[PDB]
Design a binder for this molecule. Structure first.
Ligand SMILES: CC(=O)SCCNC(=O)CCNC(=O)[C@H](O)C(C)(C)COP(=O)(O)OP(=O)(O)OC[C@H]1O[C@@H](n2cnc3c(N)ncnc32)[C@H](O)[C@@H]1OP(=O)(O)O
Length: 170
């Protein structure tokens, strides 16, 4: 119906909770399903409806050249604040409300071409945050390698919930 380059003129677009709407819905839903399948999750953790219902922020990377220059969304990164009880390196149990990575996916055939990096760098600047100051919801092996090799985040501080944080968090 619309070319994506017309809906999203920027290479990386930011959506809050405000999502023409049916086309935007389809794009986000398909990407969310792809991410959850990649992670062997029982259901999508990212969808258009969930975006509308939550206070999350979704970054979408568009390859403007694809589909005869009409554009295709090739990856997304979803972040949001979560209230968390966390343990520091000495075992002090601290209440915190960090910005968290909640979902993150680049189309499998397009991985390892820097798209994840572009999304993550854009978000850090946009949110005015450094990677060590964030929490990570159940990060996968691929994402942990990404964080170690590109952002020097290694040897996380063990938590009892499913969130991961690194030394510089504290
Ligand atoms: C909290 C959560 O969101 S948990 C869910 C995380 N998402 C997933 O597991 C979904 C499946 N995985 C993905 O979609 C991707 O692997 C992502 C989004 C994590 C990374 O996106 P990509 O576009 O592939 O990352 P990008 O190309 O920018 O990689 C940057 C660096 O990260 C490291 N890296 C990325 N993938 C890997 C990997 N599979 N193995 C080892 N290192 C990797 C490399 O150092 C890479 O640089 P190099 O390619 O020059 O070696």
């Amino acid at each position: 119906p619309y070319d994506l380059n017309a809906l999203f003129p920027e290479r990386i677009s930011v959506l809050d909770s405000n999502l023409p709407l049916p086309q935007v819905t389809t794009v986000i839903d398909e990407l969310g399903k792809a991410s959850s399948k990649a992670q062997q999750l029982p259901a999508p953790i990212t969808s258009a409806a969930k975006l509308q219902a939550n206070r999350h922020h979704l970054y979408l990377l568009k390859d403007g050249e694809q589909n005869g220059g009409r554009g295709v969304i090739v990856g997304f990164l979803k972040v949001g604040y979560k209230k968390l009880f966390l343990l520091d390196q000495r075992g002090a149990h601290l209440e915190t409300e960090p910005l968290c990575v909640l979902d993150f996916y680049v189309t499998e055939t397009l991985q390892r071409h820097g798209y994840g990096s572009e999304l993550f760098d854009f978000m850090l600047k946009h949110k005015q945050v450094e990677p060590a100051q964030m929490a990570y919801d159940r990060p996968s092996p691929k994402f942990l390698s990404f964080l170690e090799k590109r952002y020097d985040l290694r040897n996380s501080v063990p938590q009892v919930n499913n969130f991961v944080v690194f030394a510089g968090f504290f």
